[PDB]
Amino acid sequence: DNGSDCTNINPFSSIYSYSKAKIQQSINQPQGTIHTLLNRNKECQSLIILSAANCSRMGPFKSLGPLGTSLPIENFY
Protein backbone atom coordinates (compact mmCIF):
# COMPACT_ATOMS: atom_id res chain seq x y z
CA ASP A 1 0.00 0.00 0.00
CA ASN A 2 2.91 2.36 0.70
CA GLY A 3 3.83 4.45 -2.34
CA SER A 4 6.98 6.21 -1.12
CA ASP A 5 9.08 3.99 -3.40
CA CYS A 6 9.53 5.22 -6.96
CA THR A 7 8.78 1.74 -8.32
CA ASN A 8 5.61 1.56 -6.22
CA ILE A 9 4.44 4.90 -7.63
CA ASN A 10 2.39 4.46 -10.78
CA PRO A 11 3.54 6.24 -13.96
CA PHE A 12 0.09 7.54 -14.92
CA SER A 13 -0.44 8.95 -11.41
CA SER A 14 2.92 10.36 -10.28
CA ILE A 15 1.61 12.06 -7.12
CA TYR A 16 3.49 9.51 -5.00
CA SER A 17 6.67 10.07 -7.01
CA TYR A 18 6.34 13.83 -6.52
CA SER A 19 5.77 13.36 -2.78
CA LYS A 20 8.87 11.15 -2.58
CA ALA A 21 10.97 13.66 -4.52
CA LYS A 22 9.71 16.44 -2.23
CA ILE A 23 11.47 14.70 0.67
CA GLN A 24 14.84 16.27 1.42
CA GLN A 25 18.11 14.35 1.29
CA SER A 26 19.69 12.92 4.42
CA ILE A 27 22.54 14.56 6.33
CA ASN A 28 24.73 11.43 6.36
CA GLN A 29 27.24 13.07 4.03
CA PRO A 30 29.61 15.24 6.12
CA GLN A 31 29.57 18.03 3.48
CA GLY A 32 33.23 17.57 2.62
CA THR A 33 35.68 16.38 -0.02
CA ILE A 34 36.31 12.66 -0.44
CA HIS A 35 40.06 12.22 0.12
CA THR A 36 41.16 8.70 -0.80
CA LEU A 37 44.19 6.92 0.67
CA LEU A 38 46.87 5.73 -1.74
CA ASN A 39 48.35 3.61 1.05
CA ARG A 40 45.16 1.53 1.26
CA ASN A 41 44.53 1.77 -2.50
CA LYS A 42 46.12 -1.61 -3.26
CA GLU A 43 44.23 -3.30 -0.41
CA CYS A 44 40.65 -2.62 0.70
CA GLN A 45 40.39 1.14 0.34
CA SER A 46 39.43 3.70 2.97
CA LEU A 47 38.13 7.26 2.79
CA ILE A 48 38.94 10.48 4.63
CA ILE A 49 36.42 13.33 4.54
CA LEU A 50 37.91 16.83 4.65
CA SER A 51 35.43 19.53 5.67
CA ALA A 52 35.37 23.08 7.04
CA ALA A 53 36.09 21.69 10.51
CA ASN A 54 39.39 20.29 9.36
CA CYS A 55 40.54 23.02 7.03
CA SER A 56 40.79 26.72 7.74
CA ARG A 57 41.82 29.85 5.90
CA MET A 58 44.62 31.81 7.46
CA GLY A 59 43.69 35.16 6.00
CA PRO A 60 45.55 38.00 4.35
CA PHE A 61 49.20 37.38 4.99
CA LYS A 62 50.62 40.55 3.42
CA SER A 63 46.70 39.15 -22.79
CA LEU A 64 45.37 36.06 -21.04
CA GLY A 65 43.21 34.28 -23.59
CA PRO A 66 42.82 31.46 -26.12
CA LEU A 67 45.62 32.53 -28.47
CA GLY A 68 44.73 29.89 -31.05
CA THR A 69 44.78 26.21 -31.94
CA SER A 70 47.62 24.18 -33.42
CA LEU A 71 47.44 23.06 -37.06
CA PRO A 72 48.54 19.71 -38.52
CA ILE A 73 52.17 19.33 -39.59
CA GLU A 74 53.22 18.20 -43.06
CA ASN A 75 56.64 17.00 -41.87
CA PHE A 76 55.03 14.79 -39.24
CA TYR A 77 58.15 12.63 -38.90
Binding site: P72, E74, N75, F76, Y77
Partner: protein, 218 residues
Protein backbone atom coordinates in the same frame (compact mmCIF):
# COMPACT_ATOMS: atom_id res chain seq x y z
CA UNK B 1 27.11 20.26 -40.47
CA UNK B 2 30.32 19.06 -41.94
CA UNK B 3 33.15 18.37 -39.60
CA UNK B 4 36.14 16.11 -39.97
CA UNK B 5 35.45 16.46 -43.62
CA UNK B 6 39.03 16.65 -44.70
CA UNK B 7 40.73 13.70 -46.21
CA UNK B 8 44.05 13.63 -44.51
CA UNK B 9 46.72 13.70 -47.15
CA UNK B 10 49.50 11.45 -46.36
CA UNK B 11 52.94 12.64 -44.84
CA UNK B 12 54.37 11.21 -48.07
CA UNK B 13 53.34 11.27 -51.71
CA UNK B 14 50.86 8.69 -52.98
CA UNK B 15 53.58 7.44 -55.36
CA UNK B 16 56.40 7.64 -52.80
CA UNK B 17 56.17 3.97 -51.74
CA UNK B 18 55.83 2.65 -55.29
CA UNK B 19 58.53 -0.10 -55.06
CA UNK B 20 56.55 -1.92 -52.35
CA UNK B 21 53.00 -0.53 -52.69
CA UNK B 22 51.56 0.66 -55.99
CA UNK B 23 50.17 4.13 -56.24
CA UNK B 24 46.92 2.61 -57.33
CA UNK B 25 46.41 0.66 -54.16
CA UNK B 26 47.09 3.73 -52.10
CA UNK B 27 44.96 5.75 -54.43
CA UNK B 28 42.12 3.30 -54.07
CA UNK B 29 42.54 2.81 -50.35
CA UNK B 30 42.62 6.50 -49.74
CA UNK B 31 40.66 7.96 -52.58
CA UNK B 32 37.80 5.65 -52.16
CA UNK B 33 37.69 4.08 -48.75
CA UNK B 34 38.74 7.08 -46.76
CA UNK B 35 36.48 9.44 -48.68
CA UNK B 36 33.61 7.10 -48.31
CA UNK B 37 33.81 7.11 -44.58
CA UNK B 38 34.21 10.82 -43.87
CA UNK B 39 31.28 11.71 -46.14
CA UNK B 40 29.03 9.43 -44.09
CA UNK B 41 30.57 10.65 -40.82
CA UNK B 42 29.69 14.28 -41.48
CA UNK B 43 26.21 13.21 -42.63
CA UNK B 44 25.68 11.38 -39.33
CA UNK B 45 27.14 14.28 -37.33
CA UNK B 46 24.85 16.82 -39.03
CA UNK B 47 21.81 15.06 -37.56
CA UNK B 48 22.88 14.88 -33.89
CA UNK B 49 24.27 18.11 -32.45
CA UNK B 50 25.37 16.38 -29.23
CA UNK B 51 27.80 14.03 -30.99
CA UNK B 52 28.68 16.87 -33.38
CA UNK B 53 30.52 18.89 -30.74
CA UNK B 54 32.98 16.27 -29.50
CA UNK B 55 36.63 15.45 -30.06
CA UNK B 56 37.37 12.46 -32.27
CA UNK B 57 38.72 10.40 -29.36
CA UNK B 58 35.82 11.48 -27.14
CA UNK B 59 33.36 10.86 -29.98
CA UNK B 60 34.71 7.33 -30.47
CA UNK B 61 34.67 6.58 -26.74
CA UNK B 62 31.10 7.86 -26.36
CA UNK B 63 29.80 6.04 -29.44
CA UNK B 64 31.37 2.80 -28.18
CA UNK B 65 28.95 3.08 -25.24
CA UNK B 66 30.74 0.41 -23.18
CA UNK B 67 30.17 -2.61 -25.41
CA UNK B 68 27.13 -1.43 -27.41
CA UNK B 69 28.48 0.55 -30.39
CA UNK B 70 26.34 3.41 -31.65
CA UNK B 71 25.56 3.73 -35.38
CA UNK B 72 28.19 6.50 -35.57
CA UNK B 73 31.00 4.51 -33.90
CA UNK B 74 31.90 2.65 -37.09
CA UNK B 75 32.45 5.49 -39.51
CA UNK B 76 34.35 7.52 -37.05
CA UNK B 77 36.47 4.67 -36.00
CA UNK B 78 37.35 3.82 -39.52
CA UNK B 79 38.25 7.34 -40.47
CA UNK B 80 40.47 7.75 -37.50
CA UNK B 81 42.19 4.46 -37.94
CA UNK B 82 42.84 4.99 -41.61
CA UNK B 83 44.31 8.36 -40.85
CA UNK B 84 46.53 6.82 -38.21
CA UNK B 85 47.62 4.19 -40.69
CA UNK B 86 48.62 6.74 -43.24
CA UNK B 87 50.71 8.60 -40.65
CA UNK B 88 52.21 5.43 -39.22
CA UNK B 89 54.11 4.71 -42.46
CA UNK B 90 57.03 6.67 -43.88
CA UNK B 91 58.76 6.92 -47.27
CA UNK B 92 61.76 5.24 -45.65
CA UNK B 93 62.52 1.72 -44.52
CA UNK B 94 62.47 0.97 -40.82
CA UNK B 95 64.23 -2.06 -39.41
CA UNK B 96 65.35 -0.72 -36.04
CA UNK B 97 63.48 0.70 -33.06
CA UNK B 98 64.48 4.16 -31.88
CA UNK B 99 66.36 4.81 -28.63
CA UNK B 100 63.43 5.55 -26.32
CA UNK B 101 61.27 2.84 -27.87
CA UNK B 102 64.01 0.21 -27.75
CA UNK B 103 64.39 0.45 -23.99
CA UNK B 104 60.65 -0.05 -23.58
CA UNK B 105 60.63 -3.02 -25.97
CA UNK B 106 63.53 -4.62 -24.11
CA UNK B 107 61.80 -3.96 -20.80
CA UNK B 108 58.59 -5.72 -21.78
CA UNK B 109 59.17 -7.99 -24.79
CA UNK B 110 62.78 -8.68 -23.84
CA UNK B 111 64.03 -8.51 -27.43
CA UNK B 112 63.23 -6.87 -30.74
CA UNK B 113 63.17 -10.31 -32.35
CA UNK B 114 60.56 -11.59 -29.89
CA UNK B 115 58.53 -8.42 -30.44
CA UNK B 116 58.56 -8.86 -34.22
CA UNK B 117 57.72 -12.56 -33.88
CA UNK B 118 54.75 -11.83 -31.61
CA UNK B 119 53.59 -9.03 -33.92
CA UNK B 120 53.68 -11.31 -36.97
CA UNK B 121 51.98 -14.12 -35.03
CA UNK B 122 49.16 -11.82 -33.89
CA UNK B 123 48.77 -10.35 -37.38
CA UNK B 124 48.49 -13.78 -39.00
CA UNK B 125 46.30 -15.20 -36.22
CA UNK B 126 43.55 -12.59 -36.61
CA UNK B 127 40.92 -14.15 -38.86
CA UNK B 128 38.96 -11.71 -41.00
CA UNK B 129 39.16 -7.93 -40.99
CA UNK B 130 40.62 -5.82 -38.22
CA UNK B 131 43.66 -3.91 -37.05
CA UNK B 132 46.66 -4.74 -34.81
CA UNK B 133 48.16 -2.16 -32.39
CA UNK B 134 51.24 -1.51 -30.28
CA UNK B 135 49.99 0.49 -27.30
CA UNK B 136 51.08 1.80 -23.91
CA UNK B 137 48.71 0.95 -21.05
CA UNK B 138 48.06 3.84 -18.67
CA UNK B 139 47.23 1.56 -15.74
CA UNK B 140 50.26 -0.75 -16.02
CA UNK B 141 52.74 1.64 -17.72
CA UNK B 142 53.91 -1.12 -20.07
CA UNK B 143 53.98 -1.80 -23.80
CA UNK B 144 51.66 -4.44 -25.26
CA UNK B 145 50.12 -5.64 -28.56
CA UNK B 146 46.39 -5.65 -29.27
CA UNK B 147 44.33 -7.13 -32.08
CA UNK B 148 40.95 -5.55 -32.64
CA UNK B 149 38.17 -6.88 -34.83
CA UNK B 150 36.79 -4.62 -37.55
CA UNK B 151 36.73 -0.92 -36.70
CA UNK B 152 37.58 -1.06 -33.00
CA UNK B 153 40.61 0.93 -31.81
CA UNK B 154 42.32 0.98 -28.42
CA UNK B 155 41.16 4.49 -27.40
CA UNK B 156 38.02 2.75 -26.10
CA UNK B 157 40.11 1.19 -23.30
CA UNK B 158 42.04 4.40 -22.50
CA UNK B 159 45.24 3.34 -24.26
CA UNK B 160 47.68 5.26 -26.46
CA UNK B 161 48.31 3.57 -29.84
CA UNK B 162 51.88 3.94 -31.10
CA UNK B 163 51.59 1.98 -34.39
CA UNK B 164 48.69 0.37 -36.31
CA UNK B 165 48.13 -1.89 -39.36
CA UNK B 166 45.13 -2.48 -41.60
CA UNK B 167 44.19 -6.11 -41.77
CA UNK B 168 41.09 -5.34 -43.74
CA UNK B 169 41.52 -7.04 -47.10
CA UNK B 170 40.95 -3.93 -49.13
CA UNK B 171 44.36 -2.79 -48.07
CA UNK B 172 46.27 -5.77 -49.43
CA UNK B 173 44.31 -7.72 -52.07
CA UNK B 174 45.23 -5.73 -55.15
CA UNK B 175 48.91 -6.15 -54.48
CA UNK B 176 49.00 -9.45 -52.72
CA UNK B 177 45.89 -11.46 -53.23
CA UNK B 178 46.22 -14.01 -50.43
CA UNK B 179 49.64 -13.86 -48.75
CA UNK B 180 49.05 -11.99 -45.50
CA UNK B 181 52.40 -13.18 -44.11
CA UNK B 182 54.22 -11.38 -46.90
CA UNK B 183 52.14 -8.30 -46.45
CA UNK B 184 53.08 -8.26 -42.83
CA UNK B 185 56.77 -9.04 -43.33
CA UNK B 186 56.98 -6.18 -45.84
CA UNK B 187 55.33 -3.75 -43.42
CA UNK B 188 57.69 -4.86 -40.64
CA UNK B 189 60.87 -4.70 -42.72
CA UNK B 190 60.45 -1.84 -45.21
CA UNK B 191 57.19 0.07 -44.55
CA UNK B 192 57.05 1.28 -40.94
CA UNK B 193 57.72 4.67 -39.33
CA UNK B 194 59.48 4.10 -36.02
CA UNK B 195 60.17 7.84 -35.74
CA UNK B 196 56.43 8.55 -35.70
CA UNK B 197 56.04 5.85 -33.04
CA UNK B 198 58.76 7.45 -30.91
CA UNK B 199 57.05 10.82 -31.36
CA UNK B 200 53.71 9.39 -30.25
CA UNK B 201 55.47 7.84 -27.25
CA UNK B 202 57.03 11.19 -26.37
CA UNK B 203 53.60 12.81 -26.65
CA UNK B 204 52.05 10.11 -24.45
CA UNK B 205 54.81 10.56 -21.86
CA UNK B 206 52.91 13.65 -20.71
CA UNK B 207 49.87 11.48 -19.94
CA UNK B 208 51.69 8.34 -18.72
CA UNK B 209 55.12 8.74 -17.12
CA UNK B 210 57.49 5.86 -17.91
CA UNK B 211 60.17 6.28 -15.26
CA UNK B 212 61.06 6.28 -11.59
CA UNK B 213 60.72 9.22 -9.20
CA UNK B 214 63.56 10.73 -7.18
CA UNK B 215 63.43 9.53 -3.57
CA UNK B 216 65.06 12.03 -1.18
CA UNK B 217 67.28 10.45 1.47
CA UNK B 218 65.69 11.50 4.76
Amino acid sequence: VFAYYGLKTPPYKLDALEPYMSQKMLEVHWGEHHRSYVEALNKQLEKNDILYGCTMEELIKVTYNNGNPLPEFSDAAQVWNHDFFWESMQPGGGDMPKLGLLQQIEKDFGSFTNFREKFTEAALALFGSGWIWLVLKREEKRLAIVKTSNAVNPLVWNDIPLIGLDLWEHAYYLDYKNDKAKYVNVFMNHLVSWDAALGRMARAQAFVNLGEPKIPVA
